[PDB]
Amino acid sequence: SSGLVPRGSHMKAMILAAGKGTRVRPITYTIPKPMIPILQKPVMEFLVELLRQHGFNQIMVNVSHLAHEIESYFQDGQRFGVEIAYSFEGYIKDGELVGKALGSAGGIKRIQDFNPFFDDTFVVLCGDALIDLDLTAAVAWHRQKGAIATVVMKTVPREDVSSYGVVVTDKSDRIVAFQEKPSVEEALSNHINTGIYIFEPEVIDYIPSNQEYDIGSQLFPKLVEMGAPFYGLAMDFEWIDIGKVPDYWQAVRGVLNGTIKNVSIPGHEQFPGIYTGLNVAVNWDKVTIQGPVYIGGMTKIEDGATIIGPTMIGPNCHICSGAVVDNCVIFEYSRLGSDVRLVDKLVFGRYCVDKTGTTIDLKAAALDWLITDSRQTDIQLSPLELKEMMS
Amino acid sequence: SSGLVPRGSHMKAMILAAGKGTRVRPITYTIPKPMIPILQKPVMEFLVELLRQHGFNQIMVNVSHLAHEIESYFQDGQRFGVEIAYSFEGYIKDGELVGKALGSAGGIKRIQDFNPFFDDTFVVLCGDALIDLDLTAAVAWHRQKGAIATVVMKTVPREDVSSYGVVVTDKSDRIVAFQEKPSVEEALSNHINTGIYIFEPEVIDYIPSNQEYDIGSQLFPKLVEMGAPFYGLAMDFEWIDIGKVPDYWQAVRGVLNGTIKNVSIPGHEQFPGIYTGLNVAVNWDKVTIQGPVYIGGMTKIEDGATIIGPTMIGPNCHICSGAVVDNCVIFEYSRLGSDVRLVDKLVFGRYCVDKTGTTIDLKAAALDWLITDSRQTDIQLSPLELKEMMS
C-alpha cells in the first residue's frame, strides 16, 4: 500500500460549543446553545457547512453542557464532508457526569496541551450564531500583516454598543483598547467582537495551562498589553446572534418572512409561502391558514383552526378546533386545545415564552388543558368540567 | 407563485424503528437498535441512503424506545436528501414518557388511520439491519404479478433455519406456509423472512385498528388463510442482522477485515489498514499497533501499549501503558488502565461483553481501576494500593 500525507487539507479550525447557554434557558435545559434548530437545520450545521465551503475540513469541537446532543449529531463528520473530534471539558464524580467549562481560551489550551494539534493558522468561532463570512479572504487578510490574532468585527447601531465587547482600532487596523458592555456615550467605537477569531498557533503560548481562561476578558487584554500583532477586520456579513430566547423567536420568523435570505425552508411549498412536512393531517377547506407557515410532518390541524404566519409548527403537533395561532413558534409534540389564542409566543415542550422573556411552566400551572404534550391519550379536561364531574 | 404537485417522487416507504431492542441489551439501554453505529455511520443511515438511491425519498418512521435518539439525528431529513416524519407509539403518564410499541403491522395502521398516507406501493424494512438490495427491481417484481404483499428472502445455511421465520413458496413463487423458528428437520425450506416487505396500500385493510399487531405472526397468517396474492422473492444481497450483542462485535471487525465489502471506514488511512481519527495522541514508535485498527480522535495511546486488529477504539479514549488490546471493540470515552488484557471483548461505557453474550458491570464490580470512563480526573487506584494507603 502507501503511507500518504496526513496533511489532508491542513486548514484546521475549532467551534466553541461548550457553553451552558444560560441566556437561552429554558431551551438550553434539554438542547445546548448549538444544536438549536433553525426550523430544522441546527445552528452548528451552518458553521460546519461554512468551514467546509472554505476548506476548513479538520474541525475540533470542545463540549461540556449537553455534550451528548452535539456528539451524537455530528460524530466524526463523514456525512458533513469534514473531520470532527471532541474535547470534553469536565470530570466525573459519583457516576454522574458534571460539566466543567474551561473557558473560550482555556478549552483551546486543553487541546494543544493534550496533543499538539494546531500547527498553522486556525479559525475559531462560537457555535451559537450562524454566519456566512467569506473565510478564504479574512484568513488571507491577516497573512500579509502577520497577525498573531485577528478579530472580525460587525457594525451594530450606535445604541446596541452596550451588548457586546467593543473593539477599538487605529489606522493600522491594530487593536489598542477593549470595552466590555459600555454605554452609548462610554463606547469608543461601534465595532463589536463577533466571536470569530483567526489565530496563528503561536498565540496559544500566552494562554496558561490548567486554568479556566476567557478570550475577550483575559487573553485579549493580555495581548494588548504585551503589544502583539493584534488586528481587526470588518465589513457586512450575515450575523444571527441568538442572545436570549426572544432572539430565537425572531430568527425563525425572519427566515419565514425572508428578512434572513441565505437560510433554506424545509418541506416543499404546498401553497405559496405555506411549507408542509410529510403526512400533515389537515383539512385545508375548513381551516384559516395565513402564510408564511411551516407545519411539520404528522401534525394534525383540526377543522376551524387559525394559523397566521410567520409561524412555525413543529412536527407531530395537534391544533384542535377553534384554536388561533398568531405569529408563534411551536416546537415538536405540542397540543393546542380548543379555545386557545397564542400571539407572539414560543412554546417549547412544557414552557411558554413570550416576546419579552417571561417563561411560564404549563405543567406547574395546571394549564395543560390548553397547551400540553400531544402524546397524552388522556384528553385533559378543564377546571370547568372538573367541577361538573363531581360538584 | 404556483401550487405545484405534492407528488414529489410519490415512491413512499417506511422504516420500522420502534423496537425495544431487548436482544442487544445492554447496548439498547442508551442507544436504540437503530442508531447503533457501524464504526461511525448508524445502521439506519445505511437504509435511508439506500431508499434514496432507489427514489424512496418520502420516508415514514415509527419510533417508541429511545425515540429522541432517532428523531434528533435524522429530523425532517434535508441533509439525507429525503423527507422523514415520525409516528410515536406510546402515551404519557405522570409527566414521564412511556414507550408502548404497536407492533410491526400495528404501527403502520396507526399511520394510515391518523391520516391516509400510503397511496401506492410502499417498501417497509426493519431499521436494525443494514442491506444493499436493488430495490428498483424487487418493487418492480411484484408489479407484474399484482402482489398485495411480497417478502424478500435470503438463503441461510441448512442449520440456521431455527433463528428466523421460514417462508415456503410453490412454483408460482406464492407463499403457502410459514414456520417461526423450526428445527433443522422441522423446517420445510431454507428461505427466511428478512423483514424487507413490499406492500400495496390495500394490505393495510387486513390489519385491525386500535390493536397491537405483528407482521409475521398475525398479518402474514391472516394473508395465507384468505388466499391473497402473497409472493416471495430471493437471491443474494448483503444482509447484516445484528441479533445479539456478539453479532455487533462481529460486524465491526468484519468491516475492518473486509469481509463486509460495501461499508466505508472512517478517518484517513495513516498506515496501511490503520485508520486514525483527528488529533490522535499516540507515539507510534513506542507502541505495538497491528492493523486493521481504527482509533477515534482525541484518543491517547500511552507508550508501550498493544492494539491488535481487527479492533475499533472509539474517540476520546485512553490506552494506558502496558495495556494489551487483542481483537476488541472499544466505544467512546473508555480508559484502559495499565496491566489490562482485553481479548475478544466489547466495552460499552461501563459494560464489558464477551463474544458469548456475558455482560459484566464494571462499576458494580469495583473494576474501574482497570476499565473506567476516561473522563475521571481521579486516577483510580487498585485494591493493592487501597491496602497500602492505610493498612
Place this chain on the structure above:
Amino acid sequence: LCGDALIDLDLTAAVAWHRQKGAIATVVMKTVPREDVSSYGVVVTDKSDRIVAFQEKPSVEEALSNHINTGIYIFEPEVIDYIPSNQEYDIGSQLFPKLVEMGAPFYGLAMDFEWIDIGKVPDYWQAVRGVLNGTIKNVSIPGHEQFPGIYTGLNVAVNWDKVTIQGPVYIGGMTKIEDGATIIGPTMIGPNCHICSGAVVDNCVIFEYSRLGSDVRLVDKLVFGRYCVDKTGTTIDLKAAALDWLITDSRQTDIQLSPLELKEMMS
C-alpha cells in the same frame, strides 16, 4: 475581604492609611519570598504607593516585584460606580485593571500580618496542624489542656494508661480511644469519634463521626466523612472502595467486617 482565609491584620491602621492618603481603592499586600510569585497575583507600585501594573500568576522571570494581592481591600463608595450593573464582574481581574488604566487614586499597602490562604484541601490539613503546633500564633486551641499539648473535648472516653498519645493533639468530645491506640500529633480528632484498639493515627486531621478500625495506619491524611484526602491532593472514595471495615462513620451499629471475615463467614 474574602472570607476563605483567616487573618490577624489590624484594620484600624490600613483603613486609616488610605484615609490619610485619599485613596479610592487600596489593596493590602503581603511580602512573600522571591519564589512564591507564581501562586498569587503580583502588584507593582511606584513611589507614591500607587498601583501601576498587575501580573496574574507570573513566574519568577515575569514577576517584577514581591507584593501580592491578599484579597483584603478597603474601598470608598465611589469605586462602586466603576462596576457595571446586572453583570458578573471580578475585583482583581476587571475592576482593578479598570482602575489602573483610568488613572484613579488606586493605591497599594504592604503590612506584616499572619495570612493563611486555604487554597486546596492540603492547605486546610496544613493549617489545622499549624494551629496545633503553634506555627500559627494568634489562634487558640479549644477544650481544656489535660496534659501539656493534649487538649481534650468534653467527656472523652479514653484510658490514658494504655494509649500512646504524643502531642500536640486535640480530641473532640464524646470520642472513645480504645486501649492500645496510637495518636501522634499534630493530629485533630473531631468529636464523636471512635479509635479502635491497635489503630495508628500519624499526623492526620480527623473530622467528626469517624470510626478508625483496628489495623489502620493513617499518615498525612485528612478524613472527612466518606472521603480520605492525603497531603498531595489525592482523594479516595471510601464508600466506592468497600473500605468501611477500616474507616467508617462512627454511628454504625453493624461492626463492619473485613474481606478476611466476609470470606470465612461463607466460602
